[PDB]
Design a protein around this ligand. Structure first.
Ligand SMILES: [N+]
Ligand SMILES: [N+]
Ligand SMILES: [N+]
Ligand SMILES: [N+]
Ligand SMILES: [N+]
Ligand SMILES: [N+]
Ligand SMILES: [N+]
Ligand SMILES: [N+]
Ligand SMILES: [N+]
Ligand SMILES: [N+]
Ligand SMILES: [N+]
Ligand SMILES: [N+]
Ligand SMILES: [N+]
Length: 116
């Protein structure tokens, strides 16, 4: 069992990273942070954004469209999306298992997350 961090921007897939810090670092570099700025300011910006409902990845004072999703996998199978059992997640945005709607929704998400 292994956790990976999936970075997306405005619906577009970027990468799967092994740790949260790697995923965060990638977004910050994408947003033009210097390596100096990250080491001196990121921990503070992330906690203050946490504390007051803001987007720590905001480049202009508004939601950045960046997201980090936490995937748990076993043998390359997605088991959980942000702590929620995958099939439960698919059901909540579509229909229940057994329906073609469920099968197509999970199929697209599987390919989306794994970069097919
Ligand atoms: N994508
Ligand atoms: N990139
Ligand atoms: N990387
Ligand atoms: N990193
Ligand atoms: N780093
Ligand atoms: N990008
Ligand atoms: N700390
Ligand atoms: N600070
Ligand atoms: N503060
Ligand atoms: N914030
Ligand atoms: N946050
Ligand atoms: N699963
Ligand atoms: N089923």
């Amino acid at each position: 069992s292994e956790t990976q961090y999936f970075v997306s921007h405005d619906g577009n897939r970027h990468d799967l990273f092994d740790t949260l810090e790697q995923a965060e670092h990638y977004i910050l570099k994408k947003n033009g942070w210097t390596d100096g700025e990250i080491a001196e300011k990121w921990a503070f910006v992330k906690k203050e954004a946490r504390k007051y409902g803001g987007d720590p990845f905001s480049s202009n004072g508004r939601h950045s469209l960046w997201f980090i999703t936490e995937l748990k996998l076993s043998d390359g199978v997605i088991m959980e999306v942000d702590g929620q059992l995958f099939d439960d997640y698919v059901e909540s945005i579509s229909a229940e298992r057994g329906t073609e709607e469920f099968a197509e929704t999970k199929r697209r998400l599987v390919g989306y997350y794994l970069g097919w």
